[PDB]
Design a protein around this ligand. Structure first.
Ligand SMILES: Nc1ncnc2c1ncn2[C@@H]1O[C@H](COP(=O)(O)OP(=O)(O)OP(=O)(O)O)[C@@H](O)[C@H]1O
Ligand SMILES: [Mn+2]
Ligand SMILES: [Mn+2]
Lengths: 20, 336
């Protein structure tokens, strides 16, 4: 499932803003 | 509404024009715990000794700011935050700088980030989400009305008050602009097609990011996600969105209009402005006014045990604060 797919991804933690 | 905003425009302006400077000193606060962190700076729970009040201190290392090319954005942030006044924006109490850093003392929003809760619960019920959404709506209408763009809508940037209401922090990307702007700014998953496209943009970016938010809150994940950013940008431009089975048709449709790749087809960026949204089906039970008045039934209330209780934030390694013998970048920050 998608959820399952998300939870094993590398972006589940807090996401920082982009800069240079 | 037009009425309100009218009056609103004047405050802002006055503050905009005569922004406040150095309203305090490091010494007048006691460093407690680190509440959160970002790509730029850090936020500590601090305590005003003379008063006994707690606040949120945002520290920016002057050199680090210079290196990440955020000189102009920092100035904007402080400048913008001191002048706004809305029920869903954090309050900036003090600001001051020193030989090595820039500080912004804001009200402490104890509830934690929506993020932590969201990741906690896993997902919000349509109605619970509509509650937050509704608050963000009013916040943009207000912001946009001051020719401002927020550009950094994410759950990490949304704090929960003692009453279940929204406190919007992180004004690091905020900009007052009449016209297009081109900076690549944001957070990957929240980036609008035209931004990633280096095409020139406006307020519509705030609207796209809202759909992304509503989606994530209701679904429990973002519409576009991958392991690395480039893969995300790519999905985001594909123009394809998939909705979870548990998304009412009403929801599906509003989102369809928000996650519109074509900016002349984008709810918020249309003829009816924010009305297109406010008027939307999904929003048919929302009492815009009661909400603005904070008179609504708050779905969830973070509970906190005692002032200065930090149980709603994660734990962070304590970097220590350091001021130099010599001034670092005086001229660049002459106006903070
Ligand atoms: N007023 C506040 N009250 C309580 N905690 C807050 C407050 N402001 C910020 N925080 C916490 O500090 C974290 C980081 O602060 P902030 O997002 O402004 O830093 P940043 O360098 O701008 O980050 P980003 O990488 O998103 O741009 C927030 O995500 C939140 O957890
Ligand atoms: Mn942030
Ligand atoms: Mn920021």
């Amino acid at each position: 499932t998608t959820y399952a797919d998300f939870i094993a991804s590398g972006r589940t933690g807090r996401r920082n803003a982009i800069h240079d | 509404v037009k009425e309100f905003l009218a009056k609103a425009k004047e405050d802002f302006l006055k503050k905009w024009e005569t922004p406040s400077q150095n309203t305090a000193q490091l010494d007048q606060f006691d460093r407690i715990k680190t509440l959160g962190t970002g790509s730029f700076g850090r936020v500590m729970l601090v305590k005003h000794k003379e008063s006994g009040n707690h606040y949120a201190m945002k520290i920016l290392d002057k050199q680090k700011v210079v290196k990440l090319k955020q000189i102009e954005h920092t100035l904007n942030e402080k400048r913008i935050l001191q002048a706004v006044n809305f029920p869903f924006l954090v309050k900036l109490e003090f600001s001051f700088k020193d030989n090595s850093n820039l500080y912004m003392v804001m009200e402490y929003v104890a509830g934690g980030e929506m993020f932590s809760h969201l990741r906690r619960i896993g997902r919000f019920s349509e109605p619970h989400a509509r509650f937050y959404a509704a608050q963000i709506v009013l916040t943009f209408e207000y912001l946009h009305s001051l020719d401002l763009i927020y550009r950094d809508l994410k759950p990490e940037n949304l704090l929960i008050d003692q009453q279940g209401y929204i406190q919007v922090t992180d004004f690091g990307f905020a900009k007052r602009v009449k016209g297009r702007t081109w900076t690549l700014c944001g957070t990957p998953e929240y980036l609008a097609p035209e931004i990633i496209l280096s095409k020139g943009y406006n307020k519509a970016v705030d609207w796209w990011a809202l759909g992304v938010l509503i989606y994530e809150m209701a679904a429990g994940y973002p519409p576009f996600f991958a392991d690395q950013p480039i893969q995300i940008y790519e999905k985001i431009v594909s123009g394809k969105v998939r909705f979870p089975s548990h998304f009412s048709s009403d929801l599906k449709d509003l989102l369809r209009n928000l996650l519109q790749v074509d900016l002349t087809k984008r709810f918020g960026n249309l003829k009816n402005g924010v009305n297109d949204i406010k008027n939307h089906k999904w929003f048919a039970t929302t009492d815009w006014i009661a909400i603005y008045q904070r008179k609504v039934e708050a779905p969830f209330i973070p509970k906190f045990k005692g002032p200065g209780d930090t149980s709603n934030f994660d734990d962070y390694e304590e970097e220590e604060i350091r001021v130099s013998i010599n001034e670092k970048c005086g001229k660049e920050f002459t106006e903070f």
